[PDB]
Write a protein that binds this ligand. Sequence first.
Ligand SMILES: NC(=O)C1=CN([C@@H]2O[C@H](COP(=O)(O)OP(=O)(O)OC[C@H]3O[C@@H](n4cnc5c(N)ncnc54)[C@H](OP(=O)(O)O)[C@@H]3O)[C@@H](O)[C@H]2O)C=CC1
Ligand code: SF4
Ligand code: SF4
Ligand code: FES
Ligand SMILES: [K+]
Ligand SMILES: [Zn+2]
Lengths: 368, 124, 115, 64, 592, 86, 70
Amino acid sequence: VSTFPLKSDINITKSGKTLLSVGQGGRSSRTGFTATVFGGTGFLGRVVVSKLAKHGTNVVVPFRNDRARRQLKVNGDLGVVNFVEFDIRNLKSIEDSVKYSDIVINLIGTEHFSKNFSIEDVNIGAAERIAKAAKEAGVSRLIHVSSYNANPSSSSDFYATKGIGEQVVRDNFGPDATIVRPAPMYFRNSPFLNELLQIKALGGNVIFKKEVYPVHALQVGEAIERIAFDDATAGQTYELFGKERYSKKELREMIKHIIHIGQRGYYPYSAGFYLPAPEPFLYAFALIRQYISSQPRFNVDQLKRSHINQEIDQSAKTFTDLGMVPDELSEYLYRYVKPHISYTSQTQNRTVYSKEDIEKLRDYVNTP
Amino acid sequence: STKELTTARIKDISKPDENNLQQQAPNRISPWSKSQKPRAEAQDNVRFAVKDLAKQPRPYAAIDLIYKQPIRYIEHDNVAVCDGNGGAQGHPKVYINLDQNKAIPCGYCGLRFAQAAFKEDIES
Amino acid sequence: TNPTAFAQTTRYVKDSTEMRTLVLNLYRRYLRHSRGFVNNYNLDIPASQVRTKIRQEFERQRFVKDLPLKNVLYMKAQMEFQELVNFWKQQCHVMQYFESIKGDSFVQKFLKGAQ
Amino acid sequence: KDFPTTGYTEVRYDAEKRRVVYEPLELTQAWRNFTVGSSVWEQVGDGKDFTPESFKLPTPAPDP
Amino acid sequence: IPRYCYHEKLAVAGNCRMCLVASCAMPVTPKIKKAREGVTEMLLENHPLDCPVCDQGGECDLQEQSLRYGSDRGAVENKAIGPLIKTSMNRCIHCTRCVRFLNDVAGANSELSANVIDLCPVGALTSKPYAFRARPWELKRTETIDVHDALGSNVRVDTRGIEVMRVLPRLNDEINEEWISDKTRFACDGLKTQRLTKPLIRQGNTFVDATWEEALATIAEGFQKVQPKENEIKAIVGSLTDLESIVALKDLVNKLGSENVSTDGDATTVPPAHGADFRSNYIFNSTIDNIEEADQILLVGTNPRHEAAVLNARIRKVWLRSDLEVHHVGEEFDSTFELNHLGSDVNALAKALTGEVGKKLSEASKPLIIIGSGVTETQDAEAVYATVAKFVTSNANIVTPEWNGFNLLHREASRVGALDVGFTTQSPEVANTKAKFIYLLGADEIVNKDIPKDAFVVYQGHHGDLGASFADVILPGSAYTEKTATYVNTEGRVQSTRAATNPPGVAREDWMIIRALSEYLGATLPYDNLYEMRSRLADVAPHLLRHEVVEPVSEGIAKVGFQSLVLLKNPIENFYFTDVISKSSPTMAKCV
Amino acid sequence: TDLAKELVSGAPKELITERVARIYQETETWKIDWDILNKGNRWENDLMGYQSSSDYMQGTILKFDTREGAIRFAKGQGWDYYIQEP
Amino acid sequence: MSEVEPGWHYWLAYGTDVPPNQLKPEEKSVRAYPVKKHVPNLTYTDGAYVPYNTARPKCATWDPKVTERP
Ligand SMILES: NC(=O)C1=CN([C@@H]2O[C@H](COP(=O)(O)OP(=O)(O)OC[C@H]3O[C@@H](n4cnc5c(N)ncnc54)[C@H](OP(=O)(O)O)[C@@H]3O)[C@@H](O)[C@H]2O)C=CC1
Ligand code: SF4
Ligand code: SF4
Ligand code: FES
Ligand SMILES: [K+]
Ligand SMILES: [Zn+2]
C-alpha cells in the first residue's frame, strides 16, 4: 500500500528506458511503469492489479473471462487498466499483452487439468511461452509465481510441473527472471481457507492432515509490488511464508468454534462436518468426478499432496530480504472467517477473537 | 524515414498516401504546428495495443485544403472585404489592405486576397 | 416535534468546573457504549481497544485552556456520540476510523521528491 | 470562505478492503482560475440616492 | 477618469480627448457622460473587428473604456520593426505613446524597444513570441525579480500551469521604474529548451540517465578516488546562482577542509580590486533612486547600454530634465545620451581627475562615480581602484553623512550576494593550487578557468551548455522561476524570488542538492529546511534576512574601506548571449 | 484574539504545520493565497494532457478590506504567513 | 440507430420536411474533402475511439554532448 511505492521519482529499467513519476501517489498519479499481469482475474491477480493500479502503474490484464475482468477497471484511473482478450494457445494475443510493458507478472497456474489444458500445458507450456514472448518484446523484469513446494523431481504432478516451470522460465527469459514461491494464501475468498470453511468436506481425515506455513495474501501482493519496483530483486527466488506452522486439522477445528457450529453437541456430526472415508474411496471419487463433474473438484493429485507437507527451501530468500515482517494468521484469522459466523448480527454480543484469543483457542483445540 | 512524421514543416516533401496511417492527416504527412504531437508518437501507446488504427478519427488537414483555394483578385481597388462568405453565418467582416505586392490571407478564413495588377509577380 | 434519541440541548457553559464535570460524564458514556459500538459496527477489534481509542481522543484535548473552545469541543463531542449510538454512521466510516496509523530522513525524502 | 471548494478528501472503493474509503484529494484536471480577469476598473458608479425627503436631515437657512 | 494618451512617465499629449471634464494638459455630469460617449464612438468608427484574434482581447483599454464610458450600440498596411514586436496598425488609436518612448526614453533597434508593447494600449503592437498562445484570464501572476542582470528589476511572471508564458515589468520606483530590457522578457523560452531534467552519468564520451541515489554515489566514489587535499577542492559559482546555494556550497567545502571557493569570473587579481572586506567597497551606495539627483557622474570602464540597460535609461531621463554632465572613461560606444569621452585607459582617468572633471566633482553637491564590472577583470584594476579611492578619500563631498558618492555597478546577479557571504577567496596561495574535485554550481564561464584532465568535475545547473559538457556527473537544478531563492542586487538590497512553477523532470532545489551530497560525503550540513537554511544566512550576514531593504553602510566605516584600496574594454561582446537561459532561447537567435 | 480557532475549524493540520500563506495587496483589497507545493503543484496527465494537482488550496483566494483584517484572520487560524509589503 | 446517416437522422426526427435527397443546390453542404461511407458507432469493437493528448511535452530535455577537457 503506502502512499508512494517508489524510492525515487526516476527509475531506469534494465532495458534502457528512463521512467519518471508524477504526483504524490494517489489515483491521479503515475509511476511511469507499464506492467502486464497474466492471470489478473484470478484470486491473486485482483490483489496485485489493485495495488499496481492504485498508484498509477498502467496494467495490461489479458483475460479469457469477460465478466471477471470488469471489477478490475475500478482499481485505477482512466486509461490505467487495459484489457487484452487472449488465450495461451494463441501467440499473437500473448505478444500484444507484453508489447509495451516494462514488467511482466505471471500468475497463470492450475492444480487441476481439464478437457482442454493439462497441468503440463499451463504450469510449463504457458510459463515458457510467456517468458519467451516477454524476452522478444524487450521486457526488463519478469516475475513468475510458482508454488511453495516446487520440485522438478516430485511425486506430485502439481509440485513437479511447478518446479520444472521455474527452470523453463530462467532458461527462456534468462538468469534475471525472478521467482516467487508463496505458501498457502489466506484472504477473503481464499482457496486455502475456503476448503477449511466448507461444511461437507468429504474425507477430511486424510485431506486435512497436511501442515503448511500460511501467508497473508495482501503481503504476497505487497511483496510482488516490492520486487517489480526494485531491480535488486532480479534473478532471485523468494519463499513467502508465515512464521508459524499449522496443520489443516488444527485450523479446521479452530474455525469450527469461531463459526460456533459446536454450540450444539449434535449439529456438527449431523450436518456432515466430519466425513471420514477410506483413501481408496477418496481416490475413486476424485477420479470419477474428473470425467463426470464439469467443475474442478478435489482431484487425484490434491489427494497425493495431502500427505506431502510444506518444505521451506533454505537457500531462497524470505520476507526479511524484502524488508518486511510477515503477518500472523492469528491476527487475521477472525476477520476472514467473520463472514461465515452463523448468527452474529449483534444478537446479544459479538465474540471478537483478538490475536491473543486465537492462540488460546489453538491450545484448546489441541487439547484431547 | 521518421523525419517527415515527427517534424513540423511548411510543405510536405513527398506525396501523401491516404492509406498510410502514420501520417498526421490523410492528406498531409507532417504536423502543421510546432507544439502538435506527431501522430506516429501518439499511436505508440498501451491503449492502441489491440485497436484498429484505420477506424480512428482522421480529419483532413485544413492547412493543405485552405491553400488549394485560388488567390482572390480585386479589380480597381486596394482593399479586400471578407465576411466569411456566409454573412450572419460567416465570420466578422474585416478589411484587408493590398498595398504590398503579395497575397495577404484573411484573418479568419485564410483566403488569400491580392490585387489583379500584382498577379504575375505573385504567380512567380 | 421531539428530538432524536440521545439528543442534548445546546447550552453555553460559563463555568470551568461545571464544564469539567460534563466532559467526564460524556467520557463515561463513551466507555459504556464501547461494547455497543463493536456490536453494531461489526468491528474486528475488542471493546478494550475501542475504549483505548476513546481515551486517546480525550487525552488530545486534555490541556485546552480557553473556555469558548471547550464548549465547541464539547458540543462536537456530543454530536459524534449521538451519531455513533444511533447507528447513523455507515460501517465503512467506523472501520476507517480505526485504520488511522517512522518519518524518513532528509536524503530519503530528497530521493523520492520529498513533500 | 477559507474552506476550499473541492474539500480535502475523496472516496473510492478499495478492492483489498472490500469497502469505500476516504483518501486525500487528487484531481486529474485541477480547477482553473479564470476569475483573475477581474476588471482593473470599477463598472458601477456611486449610484443615485432615493432616501425619502421625510428622512433627510434639515439644512440650516441662510443668514437673515 | 478615462484616458488613452495620459501616462505620467511620458510627455503630455492631447490627441485622445478622453480625459475631458484635456485634464492631462490642463493644470490645476450628463454633458461629460455624453462627451465620453461621443469620443468613444470616434475611435470605434474605424477600428477593425479583431477582438477574437487580437492578443489584447482580455486586457484591452479600448474595450474596457468602450464598455465603461460608451454606448453599447454603434485599412492601414502592416510594418516590420523587428522579430520581437508584431505590428497590426489597423488597430492603432493614434495615441503617440510609442513615439514618446522610442525617442525620449529609448533614445533610438534598442535594448528597451520591446517596452513599447506595454505602452501601446491596443493590439497595434503585441509580443510576437507570445502571439496567439494565451489569454490574460488564463494566467497566474507571480511577483519575482530578474536575474538576467545585476539590477534585479522587479518583473511579473505570468504562468499557465507548468509553462511560463510571458514576462512583464512590475512597478518599483527604486530599481527599474516600470521598464525591463528585451533580454528580461524574451529569454523565457530558454526555460523550455536544453533543460537539465535527469541526472546524467558520463561513461566514456556519452551521457546516460541516472537516479539521484546513484549520481550522489558516483561523486562519493569520485571524491574518494582523486582524494583532493586541503585546498584542492575547487567550487565555482556562476552568474545565475541563488544565495541559499552559495552558502550551502561554501560550508560543504569548508567541512572538507577547503577554502578554494571562487566565481566563474576571470579577475587576474585573486582578491578583487574592490575587496569583499567592506560592503561599501562593492555596492551602489548612492542607490539607484538617487541617480535622479545627480550632478556629475563618472563612468569608469562601464557600458550601461549592455551592463545594465534599465538603469542606463535613468541617466538619459535626468540628462533631459536638467543639465547633467556625465564623463566616461574607457572604450567608446554608441550611447542613448550625450557623453564627454575622455580616454580609453587609466592614464586619462588620473589625468581627468587632475582636470576640469575633478573640479566639478569637488564642488558638486551630489557627485557620482561608477566603476564597471569588467574593470576588475582588466589589468589596471589596482590603478583604477586606487586612483578613484584616493580621490574619494581626499575630498569631502563624496563621503558625507547625507550622501555617499562611490558606487560599483555589476552585471551578474550572483556577484554581490556571493561577496556578502564572503564567497571569494582572499589568497593566491589557495587559488593557484591544482584542483582534483571541481563542483560547477551553475558556472558556464570556464573558457578561461583551468580544469585539470584528471580532476573530477560535477556540473549542477538548470541548462545544458559548455559547462555541462565538461562534467563527469551532471546534477539537474532549478531555474529562478522555479525556486524560492534570494538574490542581492548591486545596491545591496535583499530580494527574494517567489516560486511560480515546479522544476522539470526530477530536478531539485539547488541548495537541497548540495545538502544531500553532504550526507554522502560525510560533511553533513545541519540544514533540514529553508527556514533553517535562511537562519544560517543571518549567521553569515545579519542583513540578508531583510527583504527589499537596503542596509546603508555607516559613514565612518565606509571611509576606511575606501582608503584601503590605495584598455578598459567593455565586458559584453554579445548582448543577446549573457546567461545560459538566453543562449537556449530561440527568440534570441532570431535577434542574432 | 489568541484563541486556537484551528482546533474547532475542522481544517487539516497541514495548513498550520506545513503550508505557508501570503498576505498581499495586489490594488485596493488585501488577499491571502498559499505558496505552491514544491512537488505536486502540477503534473501533466498522461491520457489527455490535463493539469493534475494534489494541492487543495491552489484555487482558494481570500479577500479582505483592510491589512488589519488579513493579519488578524491568519493569526486566528494559526496560519504560517508572511506579508508581502507593497 | 447509429447506422442511420446524419442526413436522414434529422428528417426521421421530423426536424425538416425536405429529405436530404431533395435539397436545393444552395442549401446543400459543400465539402472540400472526400466523403466516405457512413460509419456507425464503433463502441464494443476494435474501432472504438481512443483518446490521446495532441500536444507535445511542454519542455525538451538537453541532448547531451561531450567535449574534451583542455
Ligand atoms: N493458496 C494459493 O492460492 C496458492 C497459489 N499458488 C499459485 O499462485 C498463482 C495465483 O493463483 P491464485 O490467484 O491464488 O488462484 P487461481 O486458481 O485463480 O490462479 C489461476 C490464474 O491463472 C489463470 N489460468 C489458469 N489456467 C489458465 C489457462 N489455461 N489459460 C489462461 N489462464 C489460466 C486463471 O485465469 P481465470 O481467472 O480467467 O480462470 C487465473 O487468473 C497460481 O499460479 C498458483 O499456482 C501456489 C501456492 C499457494
Ligand atoms: S485592440 Fe482592443 S478593441 Fe481593438 S481588436 Fe484588439 S481587443 Fe478588440
Ligand atoms: S501604435 Fe499603439 S502606442 Fe503608438 S500611437 Fe498607436 S495606439 Fe498609441
Ligand atoms: S488623456 Fe487627456 S486628452 Fe488624452
Ligand atoms: K499592447
Ligand atoms: Zn474572411
